[PDB]
Design an enzyme around this catalytic site. Structure first.
Site, PDB file in Angstrom:
ATOM      1  N   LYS A 158      26.046 -48.618  29.027  1.00 59.04           N
ATOM      2  CA  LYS A 158      25.138 -47.557  29.435  1.00 59.04           C
ATOM      3  C   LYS A 158      23.781 -47.984  29.910  1.00 59.04           C
ATOM      4  O   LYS A 158      23.352 -47.562  30.994  1.00 59.04           O
ATOM      5  CB  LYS A 158      24.955 -46.528  28.316  1.00 59.04           C
ATOM      6  CG  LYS A 158      26.105 -45.514  28.199  1.00 59.04           C
ATOM      7  CD  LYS A 158      25.877 -44.386  27.177  1.00 59.04           C
ATOM      8  CE  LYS A 158      25.842 -44.880  25.767  1.00 59.04           C
ATOM      9  NZ  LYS A 158      24.591 -45.612  25.436  1.00 59.04           N
ATOM     10  N   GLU A 185      15.863 -47.610  25.780  1.00 60.19           N
ATOM     11  CA  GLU A 185      16.148 -47.548  24.350  1.00 60.19           C
ATOM     12  C   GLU A 185      14.883 -48.141  23.767  1.00 60.19           C
ATOM     13  O   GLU A 185      14.400 -49.165  24.258  1.00 60.19           O
ATOM     14  CB  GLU A 185      17.324 -48.449  24.021  1.00 60.19           C
ATOM     15  CG  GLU A 185      18.164 -47.964  22.885  1.00 60.19           C
ATOM     16  CD  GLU A 185      19.569 -48.535  22.928  1.00 60.19           C
ATOM     17  OE1 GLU A 185      19.718 -49.789  22.847  1.00 60.19           O
ATOM     18  OE2 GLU A 185      20.510 -47.698  23.090  1.00 60.19           O
ATOM     19  N   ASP A 218      17.433 -43.142  28.416  1.00 63.21           N
ATOM     20  CA  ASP A 218      18.418 -43.891  27.711  1.00 63.21           C
ATOM     21  C   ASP A 218      18.665 -43.076  26.452  1.00 63.21           C
ATOM     22  O   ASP A 218      17.909 -43.156  25.465  1.00 63.21           O
ATOM     23  CB  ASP A 218      17.847 -45.248  27.413  1.00 63.21           C
ATOM     24  CG  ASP A 218      18.899 -46.275  27.307  1.00 63.21           C
ATOM     25  OD1 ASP A 218      19.456 -46.359  26.182  1.00 63.21           O
ATOM     26  OD2 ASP A 218      19.166 -46.958  28.340  1.00 63.21           O
ATOM     27  N   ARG A 219      19.693 -42.241  26.538  1.00 66.77           N
ATOM     28  CA  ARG A 219      20.079 -41.326  25.487  1.00 66.77           C
ATOM     29  C   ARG A 219      19.154 -40.093  25.399  1.00 66.77           C
ATOM     30  O   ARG A 219      18.054 -40.077  25.933  1.00 66.77           O
ATOM     31  CB  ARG A 219      20.193 -42.059  24.156  1.00 66.77           C
ATOM     32  CG  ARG A 219      21.371 -43.041  24.088  1.00 66.77           C
ATOM     33  CD  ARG A 219      21.651 -43.420  22.642  1.00 66.77           C
ATOM     34  NE  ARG A 219      23.087 -43.445  22.348  1.00 66.77           N
ATOM     35  CZ  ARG A 219      23.741 -44.572  22.170  1.00 66.77           C
ATOM     36  NH1 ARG A 219      23.093 -45.707  22.245  1.00 66.77           N
ATOM     37  NH2 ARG A 219      25.027 -44.585  21.971  1.00 66.77           N
ATOM     38  N   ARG A 237      28.592 -56.284  23.041  1.00 68.78           N
ATOM     39  CA  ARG A 237      27.322 -55.618  23.180  1.00 68.78           C
ATOM     40  C   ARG A 237      26.591 -55.409  21.878  1.00 68.78           C
ATOM     41  O   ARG A 237      25.875 -54.419  21.675  1.00 68.78           O
ATOM     42  CB  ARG A 237      27.457 -54.355  24.019  1.00 68.78           C
ATOM     43  CG  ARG A 237      27.709 -54.715  25.485  1.00 68.78           C
ATOM     44  CD  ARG A 237      27.543 -53.544  26.406  1.00 68.78           C
ATOM     45  NE  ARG A 237      26.176 -53.034  26.492  1.00 68.78           N
ATOM     46  CZ  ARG A 237      25.251 -53.472  27.349  1.00 68.78           C
ATOM     47  NH1 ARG A 237      25.529 -54.486  28.169  1.00 68.78           N
ATOM     48  NH2 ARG A 237      24.137 -52.746  27.563  1.00 68.78           N
ATOM     49  N   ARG A 291      23.781 -55.562  19.370  1.00 70.31           N
ATOM     50  CA  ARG A 291      22.329 -55.500  19.354  1.00 70.31           C
ATOM     51  C   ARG A 291      21.975 -56.414  18.155  1.00 70.31           C
ATOM     52  O   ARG A 291      22.845 -56.684  17.292  1.00 70.31           O
ATOM     53  CB  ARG A 291      21.916 -54.050  19.054  1.00 70.31           C
ATOM     54  CG  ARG A 291      20.724 -53.503  19.826  1.00 70.31           C
ATOM     55  CD  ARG A 291      20.996 -53.217  21.314  1.00 70.31           C
ATOM     56  NE  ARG A 291      22.342 -52.709  21.569  1.00 70.31           N
ATOM     57  CZ  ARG A 291      22.729 -52.095  22.687  1.00 70.31           C
ATOM     58  NH1 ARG A 291      21.861 -51.890  23.673  1.00 70.31           N
ATOM     59  NH2 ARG A 291      24.004 -51.759  22.852  1.00 70.31           N
ATOM     60  N   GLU A 333      23.329 -55.710  14.505  1.00 72.57           N
ATOM     61  CA  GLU A 333      24.527 -54.906  14.481  1.00 72.57           C
ATOM     62  C   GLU A 333      25.679 -55.723  13.900  1.00 72.57           C
ATOM     63  O   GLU A 333      25.546 -56.912  13.707  1.00 72.57           O
ATOM     64  CB  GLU A 333      24.844 -54.443  15.910  1.00 72.57           C
ATOM     65  CG  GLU A 333      25.905 -53.354  16.010  1.00 72.57           C
ATOM     66  CD  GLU A 333      26.017 -52.745  17.398  1.00 72.57           C
ATOM     67  OE1 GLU A 333      25.169 -53.029  18.272  1.00 72.57           O
ATOM     68  OE2 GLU A 333      26.968 -51.965  17.601  1.00 72.57           O
TER      69      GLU A 333
END
Ligand SMILES: O=c1[nH]c(=O)n([C@@H]2CO[C@H](CO)[C@@H](O)C2)cc1I
Ligand SMILES: O=c1[nH]c(=O)n([C@@H]2CO[C@H](CO)[C@@H](O)C2)cc1I
EC number: 2.7.1.21
Lengths: 300, 304
Positions: free
Chosen positions: B17, B34, B107-108, B165, B167, B170
Site C-alpha cells: 500500500k 504512515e 496512508d490509511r 513487509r 516493519r 513486527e
C-alpha cells in the site's frame, strides 16, 4: 422546531454536583456508574485509585500506571462519547425551552480534565492526554458547562463524605483535578478574549495569562523537540483544544452552600444559558427516551 | 472555489500500500504517510514492537488477556493519534461535494486505528469488545468526499508478501493476518449493506453487488456475550455505538484495488479508480495551500 436546553454540570469530584442536579420537560443523564463498575469493565473506579496507590508506593512503574490509567480513562468516557454522538444530529442552531437536558458531566471530563490531572499525577503521558484531546467531539451549539467552586478545606470535607466504590481519598488527586478545572475555566476566558496560544507560547519560557490556562501543561519536555519547539502533531492537538473550548458557555456554580441553595443557584444561572432548536419535531421525544434509557441502564 | 480529491489507501498490512501511493505521487498531489516516527518516537517508544510482543506474550501465556488488553488499548491510542489530529485540523477546510486543484493521498484512514485494528485485536483475544466500541464512538464525523481504497490480494500471496513487509518490531503473525483480512472484508461488506438500506437493528435477529447478510458485516462481531444484557439483548450503550458505526461508514466511498499485480500496475490501477471518486470544494480558496503545508509538514515530521 421545539427548543432544547442542555446543561452539563462538571467540575472536580467531591463537591456535591450529582446531588444538586437531582434536586432540579427536564430529564437527567446521571453518572454512568453501572458502566464503570460492570458493563464496560469490572470496577473501573477502583482500578484507577489502586493504580495511583501502587504507583505512589513504587510497587509499579510510571509506565505501567500510564498503560492502566490510559486504558481506564477510555472506559470512563465511553458513555459520554456515544451519548454525544447519538445526540449531535438532533441539535439545531442556537435559539421557555420544550426540554432541558441536565447532564452529569461533559465529554471533556473524561477526554481532557481527568487525563491532565492524571498526567499531573505522574500516571499518564502528555502524549496520551493529547490523543484524547484530538478525539474531543465537535462542540455543538448551546454547550453550557457549569463548573463548581468550593474552598479547598471545604472540598476535603465533601470529598470525604462521598467516595464512589473503589475510591481512595487522594488529596493529591484532589489538588490536581481542582487545578485542572481552574485552568479549564481560564482557558475558556483566554480564548473568548481573543487569546492565541501560538502567539503567547513564548511567554511560557482582560483575559488570563497563557501561563494560567491549560496550555501551560503542554510545555512538557516529551512534546518538545531537541530545540524546545513543540512538535507539530502536538501543536495541532492544541489547535483542536482551542477550537473545542472556545464555543463552550461556561457558568460557575458556588458549592459552598446547602443542597437547596446549590439547586437554587443552578436555576438562576440557567437564564443566561444558550438554547438551541432540534433538527426535527420528533427530536424532543427521541432525546427523552435516550436520556431516560441511559439513566435506567447506567445509573446507580 | 477550488475542488479537492481525498483518497485514503487502506487495508491490511503487508500488501504494498505505502509503495503504490509513493508511486502515484511521483506522477497538485501531496502525500500523508504512515506516521512511523510518531509510532517509534514522538508518541511513545517503539509502539509497533510493543503491540506484537504483547500478542506474543499473551499467546505464550506469559501474561493474561486482561494485561494484553490494557496494553493493546493503550497502544492503539498512540497509533491513531496522528490520524485523528490530521482529520480535526482538516475538517473545517472541507466543503460540500463537488481536475482537482489538490489531491491528498493518505496512508490509511482514521478507522484503521479506531476500528479495524481494534476489532482484529479483539478477534485476537487481546482487546475487549467494550474497548473496541469506545473507539468506534470516537470515530470523527465522516467528511464529504471520503474516498477509501481497500486492497485485495489472495491469502497465499499476502502470506509470502507479509514476510516481506515487516516493519521494525513486527513479527510474522499469520493469525493476525487472517483477523485483519477478515475485519477489512467485513468493513467492505458493511458499507455495501449500509448503502443498500441495511438496518442492523432490523437484521439483528438474523445473526456493487446485492446487499450482504448482516452476518457478513462488522455487526456480527458485536454479538459478544460481554455486550449482552440478561434478556439476551445488546445493552443500549453498545447499541448506540453501533448506530454511530452505521452512521460513520454509510457516507464513505469505498473502492477496491487489486494488489495482485506489479507496483507500476497497482499505481496504474489506483489512477483509474480515481475517476469515480468524490471531490469536494474547500472552505477558503486559501485552504488549498494550508492543506498542502499540513501534509508536507506531517510527512517531514512523522514520515520514516
Ligand atoms: O475520567 C474520569 N476519571 C476518573 O477517575 N473519574 C473519577 C471517578 O470516580 C469519581 C466519580 O466522580 C471521581 O472520583 C472521579 C471520573 C471520570 I468522568
Ligand atoms: O492501529 C494500528 N495498529 C497496528 O497494529 N498497526 C500495525 C503497525 O505495524 C505495521 C504498520 O502500521 C502493521 O503491522 C500494522 C497499524 C495501525 I494504523
Amino acid at each position: 422546531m421545539p427548543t432544547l436546553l442542555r446543561v452539563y454540570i462538571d467540575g472536580p469530584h467531591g463537591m456535591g454536583k450529582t446531588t444538586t442536579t437531582q434536586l432540579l420537560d427536564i430529564v437527567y443523564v446521571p453518572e454512568p456508574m453501572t458502566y464503570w463498575r460492570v458493563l464496560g469493565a469490572s470496577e473501573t473506579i477502583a482500578n484507577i485509585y489502586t493504580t495511583q496507590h501502587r504507583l505512589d508506593q513504587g510497587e509499579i512503574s510510571a509506565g505501567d500506571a500510564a498503560v492502566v490509567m490510559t486504558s481506564a480513562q477510555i472506559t470512563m468516557g465511553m458513555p459520554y462519547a456515544v451519548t454525544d454522538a447519538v445526540l449531535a444530529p438532533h441539535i439545531g442552531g442556537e435559539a421557555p425551552p420544550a426540554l432541558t437536558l441536565i447532564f452529569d458531566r461533559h465529554p471533556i471530563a473524561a477526554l481532557l480534565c481527568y487525563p491532565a490531572a492524571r498526567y499531573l499525577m505522574g500516571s499518564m503521558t502528555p502524549q496520551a492526554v493529547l490523543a484524547f484531546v484530538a478525539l474531543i467531539p465537535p462542540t455543538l451549539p448551546g454547550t453550557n458547562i457549569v463548573l463548581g467552586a468550593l474552598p479547598e478545606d471545604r472540598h476535603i470535607d465533601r470529598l470525604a463524605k462521598r467516595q464512589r466504590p473503589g475510591e481512595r481519598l487522594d488529596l493529591a488527586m484532589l489538588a490536581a483535578i481542582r487545578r485542572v478545572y481552574g485552568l479549564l475555566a481560564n482557558t475558556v476566558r483566554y480564548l473568548q478574549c481573543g487569546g492565541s496560544w501560538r502567539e503567547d507560547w513564548g511567554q511560557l519560557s482582560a483575559r488570563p495569562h497563557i501561563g494560567d490556562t491549560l496550555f501551560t501543561l503542554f510545555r512538557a519536555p516529551e512534546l518538545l523537540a531537541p530545540n524546545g519547539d513543540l512538535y507539530n502533531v502536538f501543536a495541532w492537538a492544541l489547535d483542536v483544544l482551542a477550537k473545542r473550548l472556545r464555543s463552550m458557555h461556561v457558568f460557575i456554580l458556588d458549592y459552598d452552600q446547602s443542597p437547596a441553595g446549590c439547586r437554587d443557584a443552578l436555576l438562576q444561572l440557567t437564564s443566561g444559558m444558550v438554547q438551541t432548536h432540534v433538527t426535527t419535531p420528533g427530536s424532543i421525544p427521541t432525546i427523552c427516551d435516550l436520556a431516560r434509557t441511559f439513566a435506567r441502564e447506567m445509573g446507580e
